[model samples]
Target: AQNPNCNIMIFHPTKEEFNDFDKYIAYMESQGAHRAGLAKIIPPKEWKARETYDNISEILIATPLQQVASGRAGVFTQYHKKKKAMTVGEYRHLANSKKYQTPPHQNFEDLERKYWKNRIYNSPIYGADISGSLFDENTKQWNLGHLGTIQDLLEKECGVVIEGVNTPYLYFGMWKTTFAWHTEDMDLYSINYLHLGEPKTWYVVPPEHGQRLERLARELFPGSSRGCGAFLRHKVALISPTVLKENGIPFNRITQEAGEFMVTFPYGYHAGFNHGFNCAEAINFATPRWIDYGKMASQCSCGEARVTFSMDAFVRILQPERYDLWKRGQD
Candidate 1:
């Protein structure tokens, strides 16, 4: 029983692996990493990771009660038991068993909610996006606005900014906190950096297996998938790797640490869970290579009232600036 699904490749860019950001990312593409759907990059440990350590007191979070600033999200009551208003400090209390209203247990899925329910994910710590509350982390290298990120392509060439897609968001997580399976907006590439705390476990299926994963989703969660193509965006599906491997879908499990980076390719389906108390940041980006996927991304909104950016229009508008880059060997 030789199953390729059990494996994922990791890159260590320490000595002679890469010299610069552009070349490093281009090398990732050339080395067939993108074919795996997701891969890990361990930059030299000397690089200091970003921080929000022990600062949980005032990390303003939106519960189902309050309107999500530009975002309307609510956790399933099956997990939280109730849509309770709380801060990171209170959430940690729940995770720590200090708040015993709903307690986790040592046994899996017994007298507690670990597998069947109780995964608190998707709290946008600072979605307001203002001047005063700007993330205090130094993000010259990791943020989407910087070079080597595909999200930077439009701004560099077309001079147009995609607001929500390009904006970075912070997440706080504890043991078993999960991000459900889903693809990126507009089928663009996405990157996640775990700034601090424990590791995260990710499940990814490359673009080739994207449809097969969807087939399983449609088979398992028919209510959402039967009439709608964007069912996964609802964020309620969770299948174990056992189901995927048995069904012959390519699956890779990656454990990302505090300082490591994870990149998901276009149209790739990826999902993950946090191991313990950790804070991470993520943003969606696009590259010239993502244009075709962008074109295909529109199909997911099949028979729905949803809007996304136009890759064709963006490319059209980018011609002049892109040509300037072409003259100087740039993107």
Candidate 2:
């Protein structure tokens, strides 16, 4: 309600206003953003429209404000450290191969059919309309596609220009039985819309703060060495039912419709778990900037760097036009 930190909002428009689902999505896009998961099939507001948005900075803080517990079940696999050594690329290749190649459960098609099985709701991730398999057995790379529709939606709906692909992996029918946490190349803003029958728990820690936790995890859990991946430097954020209270404490829990949160990683530490009975559906939206941190830091993660340049000294660098666009407001 009145809390300054809470940016979530629920809207109930008239029947004529909310009749066509496409109109609602189009409205969100015009506002400057789009959905993170299953944006395509997410039914048109059968009843009302639930949305959340604000300036980029507030958007970042509004999500993940609470401190929830993290799950420590057999869900996550451990990465052992070798007494020997390997190159950065080699280690990265191995980590990617072992951790990300497969969808923890069965094929995406099967998963999509079972979870978003019905034709009533279009399957945004593995939907029949948009076909781009994330699995690649040959290269051993899970090529998650960037949903252009989502990008358009975000630009049009939320009025924020976040650079990068919004890769939606809808695990419909089943749940990841084990613990699975991997670092990303960008800052991830995720939300859980539906948890079939049960509730889930989320754990998050900012990137800069996670370095210390990794060291402790490595000391206590040697086999869990982060390896030579870029994640080694980034923080850890998790979504799970069990919170490692004895280990460390980060952010907290949220269970609400259109409940959303933002997590900045490879520098952040986070994990998620669905301990509920019914299946779960989540939306993960992120901006990939690790490869080009220098350029992106200037635009996306603008709060991290130094504040040497006075507002008067560097007015053009801020680019009022770009600022207005990101804010979805005009000068």
Candidate 3:
């Protein structure tokens, strides 16, 4: 499989530099790092991911990746819509299967027939949950938790765990398993940590280009946008770099390695696929500044599943007294 050719920035933050995640993110924001929609942060040397997770017999959900004839639009959604569940033990061999690797895949042209023959075997362990007790470590200083959901005032005010946003999701990936283009739910900031295995290839458009990209998407799928102004908010479509290059939209790429963190900004558009055989965890967080973005993006308008979390509830906890003015500043 020939990987997609794209360019993106990777920030190597010293432990001392990014020790304060919120401050670092705010600094990155002021630096216009969000212009690329995402910036990959690699922790300082000698830092290792604390692993306390034990073996699990848990049955996890897996989704299939399928490419459609809308090659011009590069439309890809879940394959066949037949979701299945299997244990991580069983999924490992299946994910590393040989057939998924055969019959070389190049680009859109390579997705002919024989190309998709083995491609059907792709079943990435998409959304698996490992509660805090399982994955938690002694320190949360430099990780997403530095200012993540834990810092979220909502949980303190509501007295409940908002699994929709607060929940930490584990993902296991193999070749061609695509996470379509979309922003974090509720337009919140998101951070993904790759625990081990091969790197995940990511594509992000600068935040400024997000609307223009939406216009291009509207042009590509007119009917989908008719009902909802934010039609692309569904996060199911996968467009290729070739299309992006042809259409004149800004595109950036990142190679997320093990023990690295990929941080996405509010309203930023990010989408990517697993290289092959990798494990990662993703969590969404909200800084006080995210409140503004939350107000801008009220809800996710997808079929059946919409954002069920309480936005107002989260904001209620963030009284001006609890946080300082510097914390709320945009730049």
Candidate 4:
């Protein structure tokens, strides 16, 4: 029950709970994302059900590129290979261009799709594994660990079907595939589970320091402010922990392994790199504490607000139920 302040907290399930999957799931569900901080859940056993790196690769290759939607639904190649950054649309254009295609790419009718399958394994590109709700009839069948359980409960209880926010996203990353600094949308909590392969390294800044870091980021990157849609524009400047430390901001680091879960608390700034090839699943959820954060994040002129659900909508649904429950003196 030790808290790591605003930094990360790492722990394993208790021996008894480790042997009981339901108990383990209940423990995680109770912590919620906001209070969990940056958590690394170390499973006791090898968690063989999570062994799906090979299967995920095959699925991606076989799924046609046309089926991959624009926006957040497709594969992304490294536009700035040295900086390790690229927008999904930018990568799609490059993958489709004749200049980038080789004999094998040209032979295929779906050049972009063929290129991604090759690049995912052979090159340094990162791809979004799939897009859609995790609670969908088909996806719930996958071995999603305890996350599948919690996601289903949240969807059913909270009516959380907001696309890109409450929905789950899969990622296929190669060595050095980097996600730039950002908070979970609307300051909601997020959980990332590494399915298989090499571990991903994460650097986290507590919510208390989030605004300070944002200020420092704007000063350093000049034009890279939150409201301007800079992140989506592919202008997101990579701010390393070394830089933040020098600026007097504290942070935590974790090398998250396969079968392990990394939980990020509300409003915390997190960024990371894949150590090598890996497949990971992530999704966002909210608890009562997230209401205020959601309001603030949505009110801000940033691009994140555009994608987030209205705080008012959730408040309307939860407040009456909560008041009635309290009136019954259940607590």
Candidate 5:
């Protein structure tokens, strides 16, 4: 089950095999992304995420969401060149704040919409959730690209849906719109499908070395932890493949192209930058094997707010169904 020499394993599935959901799931489960490196599947043409939702302007106009920059509104120019850091809502926009003041605008809603649209077009690290608008009931098909067969079955059988965490997040990124080193919530698996635009360069560290990397970061930067508050908030330092290799930590580098799916397993630490303007969708999932880890991660400081799903609560809800499946030996 262990391949000490393996880093990133690439799979090229034929059209028919790509459509076969059960086979895909079995292969993924058996190989396990965490134990190996991560799965980079060059899916068949028909299964591409770009087949649907290819228009950036249309998506931006349709979805009402906030845009992110490295810093507050006024400091956008400072970090525009070397974009890094998370986001925070403005004070006036903050709920139940005493120092609230009405934002300057003629027509507030229209102005905000136009601002976001312009930002979506120009921002380095733009992302939003378009899941709500990506489905069409009239056509009886999803407009946000297909999830393939395995995901559909997992959702149906496991009742694994979680509000916010499991949903698809659409990212529209330009050059150097970076996602810093981090793992998925509760150490669950995540699959990122590059729908359109230029490739994304990924630096991935295996789960086994995740702690070592964190420790190295702390030693180098002094105050950073696994959550990387200083790194995320102040952009104090960036983790690169060069640095990892220099520190004697192994990593795999991959340039993910359009129509490709990058799968990261539980506890994998990954960071990457968009080569150019691109659109991608990412969502998280968990299998039966993830139950114990998920529960433990839920209580960790780094996991508390990151995980939206309560595994314990979910187990309770699905206990009867799971018991029946176990009795029948179908699970």
Candidate 6:
């Protein structure tokens, strides 16, 4: 699976495949397969959360509903880059393991106190869940319950069954200033959908993007620096599929303002926030996509071919660090 070529497959539909976008998404769900490299059209103007929910519902209802697969196959979408966001102080406080010592709040107002408890427990992921409890409240900054409706549509209309019912284990909320890239625990097909706001800059480069670049850095720059060089020397912007005319400083990378794109990156080798001015909310749905690490190692080269850990292997390595707290339900 690490041949890179094997991992580079695209799921574009033929004339025989469903023509309408809704139908195509629905069909993939019915097959119990996850579709990456997917996007939904949106007006350039921002809309309220309810408006977005209505638009999503329209697409979902336009398509046929697939039976939920027993196996885990679910559509994941994210709304990153909101204009207004909860303060970072609130974020750190809720995320801090030391301050605001209290049980998780059942709603958003108490988030400061609740999140403090989460941090104290060393449970960042679950603490995030507590933050998300804002959605369950009668009044919320964003219509989180409606957002769940869209998630449900992805599963029902797409026929991509999730591992759990309404209670999904994987969830995340982001500040306009925050960014993240990490791997999942299982070998599942995952999707990151940007529902609204600025097009987040993302690089869905194959796992080999990491391996090839790192080797080049070590050979050419030598002891210039370790991971810093790796970060500074990236050839691909990850934000742009179309290569740039002139290479800019690595820290000065661009972002995707708006538009739907799909990425099938493995779970490891550091994914998230290459650099952006604001936080972007991205939804992730995971299933298992086993990685063949040996195959990846065989393909590693300074030569032309791309080689990196398969998406599956990347996720395995990252599972312990990025999201281990969530899995343990530390809260």
Whole-model lDDT per candidate: 0.58, 0.31, 0.60, 0.51, 0.52, 0.29
- TM-score order, best first, reads 3, 1, 5, 4, 2, 6
Show model 4 residue runs off by greater than 4 Å. Answer: 1-5, 15-36, 50-54, 61-123, 132-165, 226-235, 298-331
Worst 10 residues of 3 by lDDT: 322-331
Summarize candidate 4's per-residue lDDT along 58-123 as a digit string, tens digits.
333212121111112112322322223454444434444553323342422233234323433333
Model 4 accuracy (lDDT, Cα): 0.51
Q: lDDT, candidate 6, residue 77?
A: 14
Q: Give the higher-lDDT candidate: 3 or 5.
A: 3
TM-score of 1: 0.70
Shift of residue 90 alpha carbon in model 3, Å:
0.9
Local accuracy of candidate 1 as per-residue lDDT tens digits, 38-83: 8788877545443545554566555522112111121221123225
Q: What is the C-alpha lDDT profile of model 6 across 1-331, one tens digit per residue?
A: 2232322233445444422434554454444322222222222223222332322211111111111111111111112222223443343343333432234345432432232222222212111221122122342222223233322443454454433322221122222212222233232223433433323443332343444434433543344334333332222212211221122212112233332323333322222321111222333333223233311322111222222223223322334353343223322
Task: Compute the lDDT of residue 11 as modeled in candidate 6.
Answer: 46
RMSD of 5: 12.3
RMSD of each: 8.6, 16.6, 8.2, 11.6, 12.3, 16.8
Clashes of 5: 0
Model 2 lDDT per residue over 252-304, tens place = 33332222222222234445433212223344433322223212322222231
**Clash pairs of candidate 4?**
none
Could you tell me which 10 consecutive residues in candidate 4 have the lowest summed lDDT?
Answer: 64-73
Q: How far is 178's C-alpha from truth in model 4 (Å)?
A: 0.4
How many residue pairs clash in all the candidates, one count each?
2, 57, 2, 0, 0, 36
TM-score of 2: 0.36
Ranking by lDDT: 3, 1, 5, 4, 2, 6
Which 10-residue window of candidate 5 scores lowest in summed lDDT?
A: 87-96
